[PDB]
C-alpha cells in the first residue's frame, strides 16, 4: 500500500489527535457562543489614526489605545446604514462569531462597544496588509509560497467546520499578513452556523461554488471549492473563472471547465481538479475521509501541519514594518469624520451587540 507500518500508525495517530483537539475547541467555542462578551471599552479610550479599509456601511481605522499605546484595527459600522442595507443579522452574527472563536489564523476581537450612531469592533492590527496587495504586487506565488498560505486556510476551515460554521467569503482581499508572515482571516459578515444545508446567495463572484449560484441548497463543501479558487489564484496570479460581468463568471463556474497555466505542477493540477469539482459526491473535503483527503494529498506531502499550527515554520514573506502604527503596507483611503449623534439610533435592533 502507500504507507508502511510506521507511517500508517503515525498518520492514524495524528488524525485521532485532531479529533481530540476539535472536541475541546468546540466545547470552548460553545461556552462563549451562548454567553457572548459585551461593552468592554469605549470610544474616547482611543485615538483615531488612519483609515485602513472601507465598505458600504462602515470603515476600519487604525487606532491607538490611549492608556497603553497599543494599536488596533477598529471597524466602525453606521447603525442606520446597516439597517438600510439589511445587514443587522450579519453584523450581530459577525461579532458573536468573533468573540467566540479562537485559532491562530483568526483575527482576535479585543474590545467591542456601541454608541448612539455606531457599532465598534476593535480587533488586532495586522500590519503586513492584505494578501491581495502582495499577490498583485508580485504577480503570482511560487507553489511552496502558495502552499504555506493554503495550509493555514485548510487548518482554519477544519476548525471552523467542526463548529458548524461555513465561512463563505474566502478571497485574498480578506486575508491579512501578520508581522511573522502568517495569515489572519478577518471578515465574518457572511459566515453562518449551519448543521447541514443552507441556501443563501452570498459571497464574491469569482469564489462562488456552482451550488451557490444554482438554486439547490449547499453545505460546508462550498468552502473547499473556494479554497481551490484561492490556491489557483495564488499560484497563477488570476482566478480560474473570470469575465467582464458576474453573470458571465457564473456561466463559466457552472460549466466548471477549468484550464491551468503550463507552469502548474501535476500535483497542483490534481488537487485543484478535486477541489474545483462540480460534483458534490466527488469533491475533496466532502467525501467519507473529510479534510484528510486534502491534508494527505501529494501537493501537501511536505507540509508539517502541527508545525504550521504552532507557527514554527519560517514564512516565505516577512512584511516590512517601520514601527508601531506604520501603514506602509495598506492603500490610502479618503478620511471622513466619525460623528456621534446626540440621539440614539436603532437601539432595539442592536441590543445584543
Amino acid at each position: 500500500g502507500h504507507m508502511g507500518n510506521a507511517a500508517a500508525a503515525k498518520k492514524g495517530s495524528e488524525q485521532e489527535s485532531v479529533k481530540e483537539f476539535l472536541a475541546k475547541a468546540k466545547e470552548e467555542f460553545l461556552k462563549k457562543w451562548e454567553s457572548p462578551s459585551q461593552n468592554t471599552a469605549q470610544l474616547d479610550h482611543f485615538d483615531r489614526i488612519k483609515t485602513l479599509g472601507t465598505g458600504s456601511f462602515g470603515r476600519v481605522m487604525l487606532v491607538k489605545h490611549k492608556e497603553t499605546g497599543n494599536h488596533y484595527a477598529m471597524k466602525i459600522l453606521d447603525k442606520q446604514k446597516v439597517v438600510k442595507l439589511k445587514q443587522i443579522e450579519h453584523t450581530l452574527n459577525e461579532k458573536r462569531i468573533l468573540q467566540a472563536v479562537n485559532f491562530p489564523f483568526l483575527v482576535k476581537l479585543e474590545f467591542s462597544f456601541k454608541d448612539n450612531s455606531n457599532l465598534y469592533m476593535v480587533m488586532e492590527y495586522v500590519p503586513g496588509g492584505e494578501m491581495f496587495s502582495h499577490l498583485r504586487r508580485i504577480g503570482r506565488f511560487s507553489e511552496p509560497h502558495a502552499r504555506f498560505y493554503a495550509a493555514q486556510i485548510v487548518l482554519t476551515f477544519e476548525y471552523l467546520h467542526s463548529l458548524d460554521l461555513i465561512y463563505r467569503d474566502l478571497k485574498p482581499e480578506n486575508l491579512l499578513i501578520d508581522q511573522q508572515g502568517y495569515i489572519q482571516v478577518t471578515d465574518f459578515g457572511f459566515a453562518k452556523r449551519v448543521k447541514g444545508r443552507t441556501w443563501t446567495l452570498c459571497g464574491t463572484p469569482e469564489y462562488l461554488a456552482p451550488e451557490i449560484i444554482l438554486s439547490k441548497g449547499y453545505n460546508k463543501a462550498v468552502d473547499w471549492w473556494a479554497l481551490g479558487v484561492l490556491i489557483y489564484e495564488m499560484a497563477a496570479g488570476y482566478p480560474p473563472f473570470f469575465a467582464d460581468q458576474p453573470i458571465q463568471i457564473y456561466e463559466k463556474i457552472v460549466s466548471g471547465k477549468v484550464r491551468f497555466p503550463s507552469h502548474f505542477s501535476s500535483d497542483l493540477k490534481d488537487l485543484l481538479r478535486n477541489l474545483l469539482q462540480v460534483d458534490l459526491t466527488k469533491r475533496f473535503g466532502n467525501l467519507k475521509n473529510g479534510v484528510n483527503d486534502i491534508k494527505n494529498h501529494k501537493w501537501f506531502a511536505t507540509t508539517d501541519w502541527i508545525a504550521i499550527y504552532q507557527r514554527k515554520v519560517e514564512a516565505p514573506f516577512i512584511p516590512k514594518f517601520k514601527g508601531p502604527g506604520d501603514t506602509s503596507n495598506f492603500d490610502d483611503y479618503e478620511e471622513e469624520e466619525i460623528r456621534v449623534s446626540i440621539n440614539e439610533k436603532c437601539g432595539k435592533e442592536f441590543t445584543e451587540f
Partner: peptide, 18 residues
C-alpha cells in the same frame, strides 16, 4: 493569453461581495 484576458476583464482590483 489568459493573463491578458484577466487584465482586460476589469476585475483585477478588490472584489466586493454580492
Amino acid at each position: 493569453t489568459t493573463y491578458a484576458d484577466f487584465i482586460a476583464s476589469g476585475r483585477t482590483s478588490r472584489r466586493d461581495a454580492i
